[PDB]
Amino acid sequence: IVGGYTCQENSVPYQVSLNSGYHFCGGSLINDQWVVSAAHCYKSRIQVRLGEHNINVLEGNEQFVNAAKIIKHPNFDRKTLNNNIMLIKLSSPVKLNARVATVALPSSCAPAGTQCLISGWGNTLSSGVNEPDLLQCLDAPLLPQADCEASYPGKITDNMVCVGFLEGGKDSCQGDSGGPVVCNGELQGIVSWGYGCALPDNPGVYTKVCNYVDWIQDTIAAN
Amino acid sequence: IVGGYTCQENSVPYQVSLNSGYHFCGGSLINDQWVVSAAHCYKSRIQVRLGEHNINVLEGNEQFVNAAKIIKHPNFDRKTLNNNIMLIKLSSPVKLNARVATVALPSSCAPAGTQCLISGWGNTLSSGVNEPDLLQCLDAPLLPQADCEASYPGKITDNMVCVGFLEGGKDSCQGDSGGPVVCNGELQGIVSWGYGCALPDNPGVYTKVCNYVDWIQDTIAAN
Ligand SMILES: [Ca+2]
Ligand SMILES: [Ca+2]
């Protein structure tokens, strides 16, 4: 998260860190045993970490659970990033408390101009390297499709949405990938791609969750 | 036991010590004349030691009985350790008292997350040699089958259960083999195998007692 702020502790209860020796991607908790994240964050062995705040210090509220199943969307396209979404079924169900809590799924799609919350333990700078220890938060709105498509000529699908600022300075970055975009208590996006981080005229491009409610449900009823 | 504590004296009345000139394996008393253990703990001549606490000092409470019959499970695979259970018929029936007591057999297969008791006079270190004099105890839960198979690829059968901690530090070790895992006053496991002792991602493997009640009773009734 470039240009956001440090989230108040345990204030995005549904955020998870995907661990593979170190943090590499975020996701979000949809029920007690399923996490949604991004196909591009696929790894054959993932440990999910919940109730985190400081990613590099054991604080006493974490639950560490292995992925039992890792299911990329059948139409995931690596080249284009189309359908970038994946589901993770945890080896066991977590303990739901004030710090580990689900996030709802959209009842419809949120229109452009809606105000959303974005979070992650991804890069905090436009140029250079800085990985934070504390979870960063970012208030940003969905942008009109028109604006999304002009930024990325012929690069945008019916399942991608841009969230951000055309001016730059405030964005998601590497390490935020698979994490949540939440709009009026609902999971509307998933960090997917962008050119650089927080550059002018290159807003974040996100997976549009509203297009996959049916899939999810389905996937979870079948596994 | 690596990471456990000194059992309170005579607190695990059903523990036995398999003796061949020295303690080499554990086991549990199931009736006044039958003990259960692992098939790998098979020796043609065994002396059973009941009422023990300090493996190495005579305390006034022990009963020393020879094994009159030693029955390995017919399906016992040496290579794989599948069917890792045996039955020992003692030469005479013991004296049942507060220090030499039986343990119940399973009424059902206990579920992942059940809290269990593991005990033994096995190695107490994760690296290095340390064989204790006093019987050691460990509180550990049964783990989801999912974690168990993820730990030991193509190694886990329907008759094996993992018990312990994925983070390592606390486990059974050589010399604990054949001992009991008691959960809710019943015999859910027998120490079987593991890679090393108390290493991260190498939880112990146990014989799933609940798949056997029927063979046991079968066994005790025919001999
Ligand atoms: Ca932490
Ligand atoms: Ca003794």
Side-chain angles (χ1 to χ4, degrees), chain A residues 45 66 68 91-92, chain B residues 144 146-147 150 153:
Chain A
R45 291 306 216 293
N66 288 355
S91 175
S92 59
Chain B
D147 274 341

Side-chain angles (χ1 to χ4, degrees), chain B residues 49-62 64 121 133:
Chain B
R49 308 205 162 203
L50 303 101
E52 283 284 21
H53 179 60
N54 178 146
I55 214 94
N56 283 313
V57 172
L58 261 212
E59 327 133 90
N61 298 260
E62 321 68 334
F64 304 178
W121 297 266
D133 285 325

Side-chain angles (χ1 to χ4, degrees), chain A residues 18-24 43 45-47 49 56:
Chain A
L18 307 181
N19 188 110
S20 221
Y22 52 86
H23 176 73
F24 72 89
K43 319 187 149 163
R45 291 306 216 293
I46 293 167
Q47 170 185 251
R49 322 190 162 193
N56 301 285

Side-chain angles (χ1 to χ4, degrees), chain A residues 45 65-68 90-93, chain B residues 144 146-147 149-151 153 166 201:
Chain A
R45 291 306 216 293
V65 195
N66 288 355
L90 274 17
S91 175
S92 59
Chain B
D147 274 341
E149 317 203 36
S151 287
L166 264 19
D201 298 313

Side-chain angles (χ1 to χ4, degrees), chain B residues 150-169:
Chain B
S151 287
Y152 317 87
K155 300 164 265 197
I156 315 313
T157 76
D158 60 306
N159 63 256
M160 290 165 196
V161 73
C162 296
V163 187
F165 313 87
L166 264 19
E167 53 278 33

